[PDB]
Amino acid sequence: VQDVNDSSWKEFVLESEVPVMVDFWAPWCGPCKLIAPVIDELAKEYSGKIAVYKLNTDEAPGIATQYNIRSIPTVLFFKNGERKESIIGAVPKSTLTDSIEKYL
Template identity: 30%
Template sequence: MFTPLPLKGPEALDTLPTVALVFVHTPLCGTCQLARRMLEVVDAAHADQLPLYDLDANLAPEAMQAWKIESVPALLYVKNGEIAHVQYRFGDVVSLAEAIHQFLGR
């Protein structure tokens, strides 16, 4: 399911596979918990495991600043070590699944 991001600095994206998703959250954020559950549903419905990583924003202030993360929860769509898109709105599971599948080319 969620793999902890191995590094906490801005260079962490360089350690990821070619395409990956990074869920940025904080532990006490209720909206983050809801978004996490939505991502778990999308992952469970997936035939193979999503390249899904998680990062506690509280533990990575330099990365948050370098990546210009405006709020949490945030889902980073990462391609070749670069942020291709940042999703802040988690409307519903179907829309989330469609966005992820489109990004992954599935």
């Protein structure tokens, strides 16, 4: 994705055919979109395995709501448009890695 919002959520996130992961970033966090720390690493770690996305929280006041994302960052782990695991904080690298391999 370029930037995930409510429209692109169904299209990119729920329609990749492949295990999906979404970094929730916030403008008040700074330029957190191009940071996506552990998520950026899970990209090269699971090259092909996963579809790596970054949600513009301010742009999606429905997604952030629905998924109960209280922390920036937060990451959710989907398979093929189906949600498996939610790592609030999205910071302990090992847990995030653990989270794909769980279902993938």
